Design a protein around this nucleic acid. Sequence first.
DNA 1: AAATTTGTAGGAATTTTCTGCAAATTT
DNA 2: AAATTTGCAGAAAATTCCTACAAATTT
Lengths: 98, 91
Amino acid sequence: MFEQRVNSDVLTVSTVNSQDQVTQKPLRDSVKQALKNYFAQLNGQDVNDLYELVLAEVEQPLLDMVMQYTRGNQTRAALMMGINRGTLRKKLKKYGMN
Amino acid sequence: SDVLTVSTVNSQDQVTQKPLRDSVKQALKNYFAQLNGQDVNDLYELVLAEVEQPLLDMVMQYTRGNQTRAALMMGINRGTLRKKLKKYGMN
DNA sequence: AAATTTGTAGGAATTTTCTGCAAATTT
DNA sequence: AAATTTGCAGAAAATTCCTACAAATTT
């Protein structure tokens, strides 16, 4: 009765294919494509912060959404993110989301 | 100004960048919509796993398997990098 | 009025980083 | 032959979690 949903198809993005068909593709692929374009627009400059870069680029919307979902409730949000409430405040403050 | 973008196409077949953060936002909106008050429990690890894997994969490709360069580029410790690679069975 | 959340902080638990070196690999 | 990387591990540093409670807010 239940068809398998693979971990990569849990967070997906609408894409358009060669037959103008709208299909869900993994978020993984978005991250992959962004990184491929990032490397391509690098031209040998030195990087030392790529993890923090990506992490910010991904943490901000996550906090935005879980806060919208919990209607400002940091405790449910923390419980739902699977992180400590203090950690959540830290992150929120880090991104000016207070 | 935006370093991490993806390519989008509109109805006129014009291609345009958009921040990765928009993708993440869309994916989460779809996620929250799809579940009806079912409990979400470990969402941070979820997303973090969904994002760390293609990152490791791409930086390891870019550094041709060189963990030291990968780790330096990413700005984390070589041990941390190894740990993460083990975590996702990329070793 | 009662239940929940919020702000806060000291301490414990865990994770990351630092240092350093023998062995293996790449150059 | 030399330089770099790898694998590893004990310790320091940093981060996250736990605990607990008064104050504030929501139900």
